[PDB]
Design a protein around this ligand. Structure first.
Ligand SMILES: Nc1ncnc2c1ncn2[C@@H]1O[C@@H]2COP(=O)(O)O[C@H]3[C@@H](O)[C@H](n4cnc5c(N)ncnc54)O[C@@H]3COP(=O)(O)O[C@H]2[C@H]1O
Ligand SMILES: Nc1ncnc2c1ncn2[C@@H]1O[C@@H]2COP(=O)(O)O[C@H]3[C@@H](O)[C@H](n4cnc5c(N)ncnc54)O[C@@H]3COP(=O)(O)O[C@H]2[C@H]1O
Ligand SMILES: [Mn+2]
Ligand SMILES: [Mn+2]
Lengths: 314, 759, 191, 96, 90, 90
């Protein structure tokens, strides 16, 4: 089923690590997990075919940033490719550069894309070269992102938008797709705007373009060159497995190859509406400080229209 | 999680539904989800749904109502993965009942052992193994002649622990250092790493495969030659065996990666090695025919085992065609001045390199090695310091430092060998229970001549049989008996004969004269009859005739190699018999192992079927189980780990069965272990009618049922006394008997839970 | 028996402080100070065998008192070192019952007897008698299991760090006591 | 009840009675190096030593040996019990 | 799981070597003094308790900043190496 | 002192090394079979019980003529060296 990618090492932890692993097994790809010492018990370690300790001796977070140890493990284990997930090293130039150099497929865009979009300014720049709106401080805006996919063969699709406006102290809390309270016309101006930018730089794999909206204008603010936490809600309204798509793209296929099954832009539609809620140990009765300890009872839920993507809640 | 499914309603646990933009997509997600599910406690129908979903007629989209009842591939299921459950069954069993033959005690808290830090993807030097591959046996020999330094064979992975730790060192602990060994010790002539008592001890006591050890290691150390110790006549086995068995064993040993065969006879009878030697030549490998040292050539009183003796035999062995001449001082009897003279003379006499092997029993090992080195010896056997001394080999680093300022040096890297040594320093603690050799010089061996190993061993039996008080008597008798036999070379198996008879003569108040007088009325141990029968070769100088006559009792001693006289084994027949017993196709290796150790081979199979490949466990777990609240990591294969934790240990029911409460990779698991060694009364759950409980205060006369018995309503479960007047507790329904909380005898009160009857 | 403590390594000229001339000067001052027997106290078992031959030889050429050698079998070369010393003329050596010999103790009295009994120069000992005594210690040692904590096998590292027989086991204890058991190698390097 | 300080508290083992050398009753201790000292003092012993071709032995079993291996814990009771035998069986030692 | 204090109390746990939140005895000896209570905040290096080793007092410290959890020993208690003494949550 | 049989039973004694009426285990293992009852008469050398040592059966005999007294073990029981097994009165 896969051309070059026979084994993927998932260089992350938690929820997104499990998501990737699940997409890999669906495509018959072998998985390799990494865990910090501190994460010796994280359940994502039990979801992969192989697991290896990383960052021995480093601090909890630094251990998942140990590029060279990750490369050692990638190579040791026979990993054709690395999925960096979100956060951690997913947006880190040295890490992409460093994979490319080792002939290890980086399941993401090219290093130069992380470069032009690692900076808050050189992004502004690229948005100007694209000929799309930007800010020159905005009143009561909606915060609205557009999902982009793009293959190595110059095809580039969008998967409509997500409304990420519900925030607490500027951190996302509930995400809704699509943005129910805007017009079809505005939706396209924004969506086409993000395609324009992402084609303009020949963007590769999954990425997201963020916009602020006031009434009927919108203004570019950011590109995240990675999967996002809320991609879930987009898969739900469009039908398109984003994480499999990522893998397919990086292997070398093209969006519409019948196996990858991504429709033509005209044939991509919105079906229904979806909401995401992130369940965390942040205690609202204690200033949202994360609780700790053993989870003695954990019982999730089910039924029609329900999706669960488990982090370290088992 | 924690539900009790009952037999009354449908069985349904959960409806799993998956979706795609296409059927094809949905099928992949169903596949993943069925596999990713974990359900334990009860069997499920998942193996079957997978078969359906994977079938290409399912994927095609074209199936009809008679798809299943006519696709019989759907009902062939794979061999279950229950490696976890097995591992838990092993651990729970040693934790509750202890490991056999050692005192049962809390598992200690151990240091993690110091592993040498090797740069990642570093570069193993070629060594002596490459020379063999390119230029064969003669190439290695020529090479050896060129070297001014003395060369080192390392015995740490075989004779060293055979001597100090009852050969109990496990493959896991050996693999873990092998990589480093390759990188850090590339200049060794060889690694003695197989043969001796390791073959049977691996199977019999470690529940692991010696062939796997040899083969895993071969890859791990590709630069240095592997050496083994072979008893000529009987290989590594316990008998005599027909020639084709010996040749097959050797052939496989050679394929599997053994490069140098040290071949000896326990009586120095050259005929007894002739098959083996020839087989080694034919495999393209190195032959190290060996002469066993005994007596004391510095003492002319003693006229049997003299320097001319060793010289004659050195020549015959070159004539018989050995690449390297080995001198095997099994008991550490070769004093230093005699080493100088012996090695000197033998160098004047034969044109092959010489390989010396002593034991540091007396404290003079190194000194003896320094003498040997001054006289030209080509190769000597040493061990890591932490596994050296006493009845082991002298220290490899000890030797390096003792010679580094002499006329003649060793090629070793002290620092490297010290770093390796640390690993063994640590790991040795795991084997405390087998570290029983009193580890200090014993110069008495110059009187009695008991080999390194058999001293600790023979003492054990003496103690076992109530003679621990009289060990000195037995050591004196051991000496007497060697004289009674006309003075023989004592090493396995000649040594056993001398120990068997020594024990017997002490046990039965028998002197030497007592045996000459009343010998025709006395029944001597089987090994002694066998010895005089000729069943382990012919002693130099031959049997003493009067004593032979008394022991055999008219029996007619053969005068040839017992392998000449034996029906060759039929490998095709034996392989089929075994296949039957194992229930699948055995390897050429399984077969030879079954031939050599039929019983213990099958006991090994029985064991790994019950508990899986327990080889993989860390040694402290292997011998001691788990502490409450401990977590271990069990490496099944690189990258594939069982994180196992032990939470608690259930109270026993009547037959001793406890439930052991584990978490395995996040999954709570409950396994039943019968406590064999048991030194609060449960009441019923009034709600549950599967509970059968006592009605009044009294006792249990008789329990009439066993766990798993089928019952029909009204049937007799047990009988309870109430002031001596018997009354009979019956089944309240049809069902199956479960746990039984009481025994004939037990006193009981009303409410007391007695028996459980599942529907 | 005024004694000179052996340290360093006189077979190594890199090392210029504790040399054979050093031991010779001090041997004389000590005879001057008025010692009946000159003792050489190799507390750490550092005196290799060839250096023993040379050292004892030289010191015999230099002073007219008998010489008493004392080493520790820490490295595994104790006996060998004693045999060298014996070849060069040493008058007296310190040994112990086999069952209390080896490792950080003295070499075995019976070990020595048997190793020399066929050389140019012998010891005056009765093997059999010393073996019978030895049995007593073989047995009694078990009483002290709880204090028998020296890892009893050669440690050639003492040639790097130079920790005496006793203080190795001891210093390790404190290292362990104070939470540094994991880092004992660091401490030996620091020593 | 409370254990001995500084060691793990554990059941007392069942020990062998140790092998004491059999000495004839009222046997006869050889003079040795101690007599030389008493008669001829330090110089006498020194001169004696110079005469000996064999190498002489000081036995460290009762001091440095157990200082090294057993934390110097060997007790006088265990030492007295072998001393008689020592005198009879090891008379040729230079010193103890 | 609920925590109930047993008012009327009439086997020694060893450490989980893996976990550094476990503070365990280094050598055989006893507990002179426990210097902390459950829930106390500590800074790396601070004094948790004091353990005797043949009468010569030595002081067990916090291996990091954190919060004190369960305490398995009391002033008096006799201890062996490996014995779990105190737990310090991060 | 009166002897009462406890019908309802829900620490291992070692031997008194001094006393030869005590018969104790030689090595670590278990009890296969007890061949005698209390009050049985024995002649020196007779079979008292059989003890396993790594599966290889070995037989504990009477060290003299006498009478069997108390029996501290049963078929099944696990045993260590020094463990008092049977008592044989003269
Ligand atoms: N030239 C020679 N003659 C006799 N024996 C010698 C010898 N060279 C060495 N040896 C023997 O070897 C032992 C150690 O010598 P080194 O120097 O290694 O002690 C001596 C002696 O027993
Ligand atoms: N003539 C000599 N020249 C140099 N070293 C000697 C020697 N005689 C003995 N040695 C030293 O003493 C050691 C043992 O000799 P043996 O014979 O007891 O090894 C030798 C060497 O290191
Ligand atoms: Mn050997
Ligand atoms: Mn000293």
């Amino acid at each position: 089923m896969m051309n070059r990618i026979k084994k993927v090492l998932v260089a992350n932890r938690g929820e997104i690590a499990i998501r990737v692993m699940r997409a890999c097994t669906e495509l018959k790809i072998k998985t390799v997990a990494i865990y910090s010492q501190e994460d010796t018990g994280s359940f994502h370690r039990y979801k992969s075919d192989e697991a290896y300790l990383v960052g021995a001796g480093k601090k909890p977070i630094d251990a998942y940033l140990d590029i060279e140890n990750i490369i050692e493990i990638a190579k040791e284990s026979g990993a054709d490719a690395i999925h960096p997930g979100y956060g951690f090293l997913s947006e880190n130039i040295e890490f992409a550069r460093r994979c490319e150099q080792e002939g290890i497929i980086f399941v993401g865009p090219k290093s130069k894309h992380l470069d032009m979009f690692g900076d808050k300014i050189k992004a502004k720049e690229q948005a100007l070269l694209a000929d799309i709106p930007v800010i020159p401080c905005v009143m009561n805006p909606k915060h609205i992102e557009v999902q982009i996919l793009g293959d190595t063969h110059g095809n580039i699709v969008h998967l409509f938008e997500r409304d990420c406006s519900i925030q607490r102290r500027h951190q996302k809390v509930v995400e809704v797709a699509p943005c129910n309270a805007i017009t079809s016309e505005l939706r396209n101006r924004i969506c086409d705007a993000a395609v324009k930018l992402m084609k303009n730089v020949d963007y590769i794999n999954a990425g997201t373009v963020e916009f602020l909206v006031e009434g009927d204008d919108f203004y570019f603010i950011e590109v995240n060159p990675r999967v996002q936490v809320e991609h879930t809600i987009t898969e739900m309204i469009t039908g398109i497995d984003i994480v499999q798509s990522q893998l397919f793209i990086a292997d070398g296929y093209a969006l519409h190859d019948q196996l990858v099954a991504i429709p033509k832009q005209e044939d991509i539609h919105i079906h229904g509406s979806a909401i995401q809620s992130r369940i965390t140990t942040e205690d609202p009765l204690n200033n949202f400080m994360p609780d700790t300890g053993r989870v003695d009872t954990y019982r999730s839920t089910g039924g029609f229209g329900v999706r669960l993507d488990a982090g370290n809640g088992f | 999680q924690g539900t009790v499914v009952t037999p009354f309603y449908d069985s349904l646990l959960v409806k799993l539904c998956t979706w795609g933009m296409t059927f094809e997509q949905a099928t992949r997600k169903m596949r993943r989800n069925l596999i990713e599910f974990r359900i334990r406690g009860v069997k499920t129908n998942i193996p079957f749904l997978l078969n359906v979903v994977r079938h290409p007629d399912f994927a095609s989209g074209n199936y009809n109502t008679s798809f299943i009842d006519t696709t019989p591939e759907l009902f062939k299921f794979p061999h279950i993965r229950d490696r976890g459950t097995k591992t838990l069954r092993y651990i729970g069993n040693v934790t509750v009942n202890g490991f056999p033959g050692i005192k049962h005690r809390d598992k200690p808290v151990y240091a993690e052992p110091r592993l040498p830090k090797i740069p990642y993807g570093s570069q193993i030097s070629p060594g002596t193994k490459q020379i063999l591959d390119a230029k064969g046996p003669e190439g290695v020999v020529d090479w050896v002649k060129k070297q001014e330094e003395v060369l080192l064979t390392d015995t740490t992975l075989r004779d060293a622990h055979q001597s100090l730790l009852a050969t109990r060192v496990r493959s896991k602990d050996i693999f873990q250092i092998a990589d480093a060994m390759a990188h850090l010790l590339p200049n060794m002539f060889s690694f003695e790493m197989w043969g001796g008592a390791t073959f049977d001890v691996a199977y019999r006591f470690l529940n692991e495969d010696p062939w796997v050890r040899l083969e895993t290691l071969r890859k791990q150390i590709p630069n240095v030659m592997f050496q083994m110790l072979l008893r000529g006549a009987n290989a590594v086995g316990y008998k005599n065996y027909p020639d084709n068995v010996i040749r097959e064993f050797v052939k496989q040993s050679a394929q599997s990666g053994v490069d140098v065969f040290r071949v000896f006879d326990s009586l120095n009878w050259i005929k007894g090695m002739e098959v083996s030697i020839d087989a080694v030549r034919e495999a393209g490998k190195i032959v190290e025919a060996a002469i066993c040292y005994t007596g004391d050539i510095d003492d002319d009183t003693r006229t049997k085992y003299t320097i001319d003796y060793y010289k004659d035999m050195a020549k015959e062995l070159v004539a018989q065609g050995t690449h390297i001449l080995g001198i095997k001082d099994m008991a550490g009897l070769l004093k230093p001045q005699a080493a100088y003279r012996l090695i000197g003379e033998l160098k004047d006499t034969v044109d092959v390199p010489i390989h010396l092997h002593t034991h540091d029993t007396s404290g003079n090992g190194i000194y003896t090695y320094a003498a040997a080195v001054s006289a030209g010896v080509d190769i000597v056997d040493v061990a890591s310091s932490a596994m050296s001394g006493a009845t082991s080999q002298p220290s490899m680093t000890g030797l390096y430092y003792g010679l580094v300022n002499g006329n003649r040096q060793t090629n070793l890297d002290a620092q490297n060998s010290q770093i390796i040594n640390h690993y063994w320093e640590d790991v040795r603690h795991y084997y405390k229970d087998f570290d029983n050799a009193l580890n200090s010089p014993q110069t008495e061996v110059y009187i009695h001549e008991m080999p390194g190993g058999q001293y600790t061993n023979l003492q054990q039996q003496a103690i076992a049989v109530g003679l621990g008080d009289r060990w000195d008597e037995v050591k004196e008798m051991y000496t007497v008996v060697n004289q009674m036999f006309g003075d023989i070379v004592k090493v396995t198996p000649s040594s056993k004969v001398v120990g068997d008879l020594a024990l017997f003569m002490v046990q039965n108040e028998l002197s030497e004269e007592d045996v000459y007088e009343k010998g025709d009325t006395i029944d001597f141990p089987d090994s002694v009859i066998e010895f005089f029968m000729g069943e382990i070769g012919q002693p130099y100088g031959g049997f003493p005739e009067k004593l032979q006559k008394l022991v055999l009792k008219g029996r007619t001693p053969l005068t040839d190699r017992p392998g000449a006289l034996m029906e060759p084994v039929n490998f095709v027949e034996v392989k089929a018999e075994l296949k039957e017993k194992m229930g699948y196709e055995p390897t050429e290796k399984d077969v030879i192992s079954y031939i050599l150790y039929p019983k213990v081979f099958l006991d090994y199979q029985e064991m790994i079927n019950k508990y899986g490949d327990v080889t993989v466990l860390d040694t402290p777990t292997f011998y001691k189980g788990m502490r409450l609240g401990e977590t271990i990591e069990v490496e099944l294969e690189k990258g594939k780990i069982l994180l196992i934790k032990l939470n608690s240990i259930g109270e026993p029911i009547a037959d001793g069965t406890r439930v052991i409460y584990f978490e395995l990779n996040g999954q709570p698991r409950e396994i039943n272990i019968q406590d064999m060694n048991v030194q609060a009364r449960r009441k019923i759950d009034t709600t549950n009618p599967e509970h059968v409980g006592a009605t009044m205060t009294g006792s249990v006369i008789q329990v009439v049922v066993k766990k798993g018995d089928s019952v029909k309503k009204g049937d007799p479960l047990l009988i309870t006394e109430a002031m001596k007047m018997e009354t009979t507790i019956q089944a309240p329904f049809d069902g199956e008997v479960s746990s039984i909380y009481v025994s004939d005898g037990d006193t009981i009160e009303s409410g007391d839970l007695l028996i459980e009857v599942n529907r």
